Paper text:
Even though full length LCs and other proteins have recently been found as part of fibrils, patient biopsies predominantly revealed VL domains that result from proteolytic cleavage of the LC as the main constituent of amyloid deposits. The patient variant (referred to as Pat-1) contains 11 mutations in the VL domain compared to the corresponding germline sequence (referred to as WT-1).
The two sequences differ in 11 point mutations, all located in the VL domain. V81 in Pat-1 forms six hydrophobic interactions with residues in FR2 and FR3, two of them, the L15 and L82 point mutations, are located within this hydrophobic surface area. Remarkably, when we performed fibril formation assays, we found that all Pat-1 point mutants except V81L formed amyloids, suggesting that valine at position 81 is the main cause for the pathogenicity of Pat-1.
Residue numbers in the entry:
A (entry chain A), B (entry chain B): 5 to 113
The structure:
Amino acid sequence: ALTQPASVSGSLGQSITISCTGSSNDFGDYNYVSWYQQHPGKAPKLMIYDVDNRPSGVSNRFSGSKSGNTASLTISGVLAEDEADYFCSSYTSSSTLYVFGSGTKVTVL
Amino acid sequence: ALTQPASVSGSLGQSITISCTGSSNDFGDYNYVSWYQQHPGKAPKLMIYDVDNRPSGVSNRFSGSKSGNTASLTISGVLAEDEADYFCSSYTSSSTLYVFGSGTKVTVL
């Protein structure tokens, strides 16, 4: 179970951090965490993969880090279109399949 | 991109089929398409992986199949709790970016 905070709020131009906590040490040793941005209803878009790598066309405003048991997505210079659901995800044991975190609702004020 | 029908509706006890078509041949003959069930503002659950495999604890009402460049999730004996968003997903052909389909809103009447 990857646990995130239910919700976090931030004002335009401020910096918000979404934490992703896990029980086991498999992901916490090997850095296999990914971050998806989901606008309400639409497809989850990949923002970060392997802890801290951005696919081509993603704002450098989004950046990922990690510190043992918890990974973190930081969004700096928050815009209106950052209002969305955010999910962390690592691999299921001995597979390449993604299992998803509880998810964080981000409201932009 | 994996393109799905925007929405599908079915009555209780009926069968529902959701299609997942990909642009050209960018998804390695669609043998590694998975299917995720998502309740609103909730973590997407794995229902099917590798076209037709069912994880332990997933009802046998959910089954997957594939023909050419289209993968299909079928939900038998539709229950209330099948009312959800459904995304097909697969690695891009480069096997780094795990990309989600446009998504299908299943309404149960």
